Amino acid sequence: PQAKYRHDYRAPDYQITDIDLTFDLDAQKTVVTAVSQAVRHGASDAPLRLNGEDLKLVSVHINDEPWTAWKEEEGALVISNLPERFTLKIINEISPAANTALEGLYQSGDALCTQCEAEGFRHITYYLDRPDVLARFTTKIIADKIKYPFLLSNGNRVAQGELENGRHWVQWQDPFPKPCYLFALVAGDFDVLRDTFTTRSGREVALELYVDRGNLDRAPWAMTSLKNSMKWDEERFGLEYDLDIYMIVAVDFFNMGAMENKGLNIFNSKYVLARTDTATDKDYLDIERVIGHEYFHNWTGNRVTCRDWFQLSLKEGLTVFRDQEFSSDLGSRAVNRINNVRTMRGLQFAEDASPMAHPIRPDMVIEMNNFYTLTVYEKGAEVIRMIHTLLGEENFQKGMQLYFERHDGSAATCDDFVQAMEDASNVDLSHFRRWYSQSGTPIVTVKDDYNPETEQYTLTISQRTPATPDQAEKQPLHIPFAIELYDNEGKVIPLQKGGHPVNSVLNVTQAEQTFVFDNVYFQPVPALLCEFSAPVKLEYKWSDQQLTFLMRHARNDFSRWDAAQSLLATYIKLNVARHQQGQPLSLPVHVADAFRAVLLDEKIDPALAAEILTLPSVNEMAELFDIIDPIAIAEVREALTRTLATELADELLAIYNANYQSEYRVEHEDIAKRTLRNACLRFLAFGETHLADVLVSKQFHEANNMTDALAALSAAVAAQLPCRDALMQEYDDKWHQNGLVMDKWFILQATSPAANVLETVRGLLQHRSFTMSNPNRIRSLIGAFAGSNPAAFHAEDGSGYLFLVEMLTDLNSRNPQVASRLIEPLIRLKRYDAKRQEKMRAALEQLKGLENLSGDLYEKITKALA
Ligand SMILES: N[C@@H](CCCC[NH3+])C(=O)O
Ligand code: NA
Ligand code: NA
Ligand SMILES: [Zn+2]
């Protein structure tokens, strides 16, 4: 597999302006006719190089003349000796039933559906499969009427007919030019939830949600979330939908989460289907986020698209930022920010410290599907948010407006977006641009001094980004570094120097710099990197008392949570070292007291209390360490939970009871109280065994919603309670027919602390609810084991690695994209001890030797073994 490089981008020799597709649909053999209007822009002697994969070419015509001047090569059809303008007609065959990779046109149960991003359209026909080629599409679909009563593509229906032998057809037209990655086709039999949204300016939009027959009871929340998304984009960004219909199709077989195809989004059913007995609060809020995300792409991705795939973050970072702002505006901003920071500091930082590290705008890509990453998405959004921090909302919106004014109807670059923000706001972002080109996590070190003679407070701030495998050279970034200073009363000290106020967002642009503040009338307790103002690691020598002070007094709820994290970090590190020495947990009384205070604080938002009372995950804990000891981390997390459960037993039970809710509502105040109640239950499960068992079994049986049922089930598994096996069997018996519900159960099995977890996981490959043909099942059982049970995955006998190798040997051939998701835990080998590294290296070498090794895996394996 050959690497492609950002610096090699060149405008295409040919454009296509219009394409008319006809599909003669059949699961075994689909015949595609594609009539494209093409224009040469390059040299008169330049051939047309069309991309195509696994196509059976039937014919090639140019202006209806059968063409002789062509050749097929690896991945391409090369057509020579062309006029400056011409009509290209290609007929080819494809086989949806044979498509196990789920890229291009494939089968999802009885439905046929497409996934074209990034480079899937070339699996459908020979085309200029690159996003700077935008064309107006017309799509005619012919199919068996009984099997495929609904025939959907982008845009509006412009024609329909019936044919002999039980076939029918529908033709669609989408007036907006698009790159082919936004093409979609769906054929099948569905229940359809129909609604309307009227835009601010009065455009009536038909909303249509297509689900498998029998799933209409699980559709209204997604529909509600779509309308919420439409309203919010109007209110916050001033953006309206631009077409007459908005279709969403929920499919069970889907590699990713969802896809923003123009006017015809295709969603993994996991991000559509919800009812109160099948879906948790988290599922509801995820459906809201993902519905919003795909909707927000209508402008940030579709109306303005990407010039090339290296510019992916142009749409993904900005659309993730938009989905975060949507969730934060409608729900709890503090909880959203906290959770997005957890994802950054734990999961994304790990990626930036791995062999797969890349800038948010990559420079080198072998398999583009490997770059739909935490970095491109989540760090991408942090970079957009830094622009927002530097500009303020007003200037940021002016930048958005200039961006659309300049680039509407075109394919643009990350740089185009930064330039729009810079030009609209008059804020210089030249240094800032380095965030797009530099990988790795900056480390920001802060030292301070208080001078009582002069009443001056001095911050000495330094930065450095360690070299990464992809980049030997690193330079200082423009880091927006937000601070607050607190006096002894917990009041904010005004920031000023020389009689003038100073902005609280410090511009940390050098390797080292000093900031001096005057009229600091008392030695401050600083809050640093407020609201995680830059995606960086903070090094500051906190005292425990400074941190507990912040937990009490910090103005922003995020700072209170963050102070608790800093406090915990010290004792997580202490106790991991102790574990390695065979010593039990040690925790100062005053640390337990800080958490007691949180439980008993009557003024604190339950949403915030719940997050403070949610311990960092084993992945968050891992990023506190250079070399990860996954067994020590798992056991310390459990020991910390048990210690807090014992010390806070009475308070935990009181708060658990106080937050009981008889009505179930998907409403933010209710969700907050329930999150707090279940956070308490988690500790209570790890307390005295009999009380724990009674509390947990009772909640499981009495729950009137899946949030509370699953919280109880999860606690029974985590604490290995007597009731565990009974409850797990009861859930299986009730829910085995429902794959999405069983995913939760597979996750609990895969992440179990039980000694025999791998044995159980292996056996579950034969479970009635499991299948290797379904990405969701694979991720929930195998993915969760390797990625979310690092203690078992990293068993010292190497059994975890061998299991993953067996699974990847299958998946490499079946579904390389899912295989590539699942190999990720293995490529982190350098974070582990020498003995584990050698077993992981051996596993990677075995995979490197596979017959027909996919490019997806090749890219990751080669980087890992370097
Ligand atoms: N554009 C989609 C992801 C496409 C995945 C391509 N392999 C989204 O952001 O949800
Ligand atoms: Na809000
Ligand atoms: Na100091
Ligand atoms: Zn997206």
UniProtKB/Swiss-Prot annotation:
GO MF, one example: metallopeptidase activity
Keywords noted in UniProt: Aminopeptidase, Cell inner membrane, Cell membrane, Hydrolase, Membrane, Metal-binding, Metalloprotease, Protease, Zinc
Tree of life domain: Bacteria
Subcellular location: Cell inner membrane
InterPro entries: Aminopeptidase_N-like_N, Aminopeptidase_N-like_N_sf, PepN_Ig-like_sf, Peptidase_M1, Peptidase_M1_dom, Peptidase_M1_pepN, Peptidase_M1_pepN_C, Peptidase_M1_pepN_C_sf
EC number: 3.4.11.2
Family: Belongs to the peptidase M1 family.
NCBIfam families the record matches: pepN_proteo
Entry function: Aminopeptidase N is involved in the degradation of intracellular peptides generated by protein breakdown during normal growth as well as in response to nutrient starvation.
Name of the featured protein: Aminopeptidase N
